[PDB]
């Protein structure tokens, strides 16, 4: 809702992270990522932005080893220093 810019800034960090994960090697996957990111930034409907953000987070989640991902969530999400 009111957290539209917060979701748009999260999206920017996600694309930055995805770019460092060398997704560029797969053109279909890269265009899907870049596509979602660009669409989020041009969209003003929060419902539509969340749907697309959920798709980007899921793509990001898939590019991780299940084991390391659990540690990453525990460290940075569950026990955040923000």
């Amino acid at each position: 809702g009111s957290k539209l810019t917060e979701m748009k800034c999260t999206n920017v960090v996600l694309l930055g992270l995805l770019s460092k994960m060398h997704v560029e090697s797969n053109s279909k996957e890269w265009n899907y990522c870049v596509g979602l990111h660009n669409e989020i930034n041009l969209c003003d409907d929060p419902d539509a932005v969340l749907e697309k953000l959920l798709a980007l987070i899921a793509f990001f989640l898939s590019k991780h080893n299940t084991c390391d991902l659990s540690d990453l969530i525990e460290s940075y999400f569950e026990n955040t220093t923000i």
């Binding site: 460092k20 279909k28 969340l50 959920l54 525990e74 999400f77």
Partner: protein, 190 residues
């Protein structure tokens, strides 16, 4: 005329304006046109000349700036840079405090995450990983999967050995006998 300049293509619009002004004044001199028309044509030439020179120096500034920028970049991330983005990303996701974001993150923490998220096909394709019977029950709603705020229709289900699995057959009494996790291939109901 534009043989000494860096980019003749970039210099062209400002050069034509100057050359056209210079040519008018030269024709005016040869045709011994009125002193009034000559004064006008001289001013037009001075204006165009100073515009050509102004754009020429701007071009030199932009080229030098790029030359310097390239020379400093050439120097070229960290586990630290990736770590800083991970800290930012997960921090912001928590700060969002949206149930669907919390769901997706808690699922991933417990091993419920995508193996693959293949787009195009005019229908996005998700292969979801379900590590146990309890978590499988939360995401699977009959011949559908509820994941990432969407509903996906089940296409195929597989063993961790790649063997075909019938969902009707995955039951409480069977849990010990199934090689987990299960892979649910589903397509976005679009």
């Amino acid at each position: 005329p534009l043989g000494s300049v860096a980019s003749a293509y970039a210099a062209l619009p400002s050069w034509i304006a100057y050359e056209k002004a210079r040519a008018d004044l030269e024709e005016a001199k040869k045709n011994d046109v009125s002193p009034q028309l000559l004064k006008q044509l001289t001013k037009a030439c001075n204006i165009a000349k100073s515009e050509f020179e102004r754009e020429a120096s701007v071009q030199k500034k932009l080229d030098k700036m790029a030359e310097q920028a390239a020379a400093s970049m050439y120097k070229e991330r960290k586990s630290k840079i990736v770590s800083a983005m991970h800290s930012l990303l997960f921090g912001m996701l928590k700060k969002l405090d949206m149930s669907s974001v919390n769901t997706i993150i808690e699922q991933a923490r417990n091993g419920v995450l995508p193996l693959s998220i293949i787009p195009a096909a005019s229908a996005t394709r998700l292969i979801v990983v379900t590590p146990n019977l309890e978590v499988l029950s939360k995401v699977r709603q009959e011949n559908n999967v509820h994941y990432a705020g969407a509903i996906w229709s089940i296409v195929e289900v597989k063993d961790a050995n790649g063997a075909q699995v019938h969902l009707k057959e995955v039951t409480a009494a069977n849990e010990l006998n199934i090689t987990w996790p299960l892979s649910i291939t589903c397509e976005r109901t679009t």
